[PDB]
Structure 1
């Protein structure tokens, strides 16, 4: 036999558990980080890109992709409810490593100007909803609604001190706006930032809630599609050519 005793089998299984956790975690880090940055990283890099319309709308929709697939695999095959949490934690770890060692360690951009957005509460909501309900349709709908809606309230304690108005050289500016102005991004001019500028159809203080609800609806859709995407990605098929 491969193993000589039950205790040896348990120890071998624990070693395999640790090694497979390492493999899954860091492959997820690589893939999720590349997808997340090349989908929404301009808003995540700079504090003056963290607006109420585009950041709040875009970030959860594109970030709900990997958690859906990883949940569809882990909960179905192992009853492990931490897929969304592990995806968010890996993305945050990679982003923070890059910000501290490259954004600040190399180009000396201040950390308070280059910090990632908080994402743990949405992953926790998704994971808990999936674990308690046990059905992927209800998880999709309700958990994606929560994931979309909790993104901006979760990040508000961080960005709130950066929105104190300042009279800078005769013009009204935000602290994040002054941060973007002072610290020169040679490759990132001011016109590139996709932030809300006001529309003639913009109503009475409804920008952030409308963006959050739109993000939640699109998160429902993207979760529903990426659940089946991950189901396909979990196939155990062998080819002969």
Structure 2
């Protein structure tokens, strides 16, 4: 036999558990980080890109992709409810490593100007909803609604001190706006930032809630599609050519 005793089998299984956790975690880090940055990283890099319309709308929709697939695999095959949490934690770890060692360690951009957005509450909501309900349709709908809606309230304690108005050289500016102005991004001019500028159809203080609800609806859709995407990605098929 491969193993000589039950205790040896348990120890071998624990070693395999640790090694497979390492493999899954860091492959997820690589893939999720590349997808997340090349989908929404301009808003995540700079504090003056963290607006109420585009950041709040875009970030959860594109970030709900990997958690859906990883949940569809882990909960179905192992009853492990931490897929969304592990995806968010890996993305945050990679982003923070890059910000501290490259954004600040190399180009000396201040950390308070280059910090990532908080994402743990949405992953926790998704994971808990999936674990308690046990059905992927209800998880999709309700958990994606929560994931979309909790993104901006979760990040508000961080960005709130950066929105104190300042009279800078005769013009009204935000602290994040002054941060973007002072610290020169040679490759990132001011016109590139996709932030809300006001529309003639913009109503009475409804920008952030409308963006959050739109993000939640699109998160429902993207979760529903990426659940089946991950189901396909979990196939155990062998080819002969």
Secondary structure, aligned partner of 1:51: coil
By how many angstroms is 1:151 displaced?
0.0
Q: Aligned partners of 1:9, 1:24: CA distance in 2, in Å?
A: 22
Q: TM-score, normalised by structure 1?
A: 1.00
1:99 aligns with 2:99: yes
By how many angstroms is 1:64 displaced?
0.0
By how many angstroms is 1:227 displaced?
0.0
Q: TM-score, normalised by structure 2?
A: 1.00
* Structure 1 unpaired stretches of 5+: none
Secondary structure, aligned partner of 2:66: helix
By how many angstroms is 1:139 displaced?
0.0
By how many angstroms is 1:166 displaced?
0.0
By how many angstroms is 1:109 displaced?
0.0
Q: Aligned partners of 1:71, 1:45: CA distance in 2, in Å?
A: 27
CA deviation string 1:34-87 (max 9, x = no partner): 000000000000000000000000000000000000000000000000000000
Secondary structure, aligned partner of 1:103: helix
By how many angstroms is 1:173 displaced?
0.0
By how many angstroms is 1:181 displaced?
0.0
Q: Aligned partners of 1:11, 1:58: CA distance in 2, in Å?
A: 45
* Structure 2 unpaired stretches of 5+: none
By how many angstroms is 1:22 displaced?
0.0
By how many angstroms is 1:132 displaced?
0.0
Moved over 2 A (4+): none
Q: Aligned partners of 2:200, 2:128: CA distance in 1, in Å?
A: 41
Q: Aligned partners of 1:134, 1:108: CA distance in 2, in Å?
A: 47
Q: RMSD in angstroms over aligned alpha carbons? A: 0.0
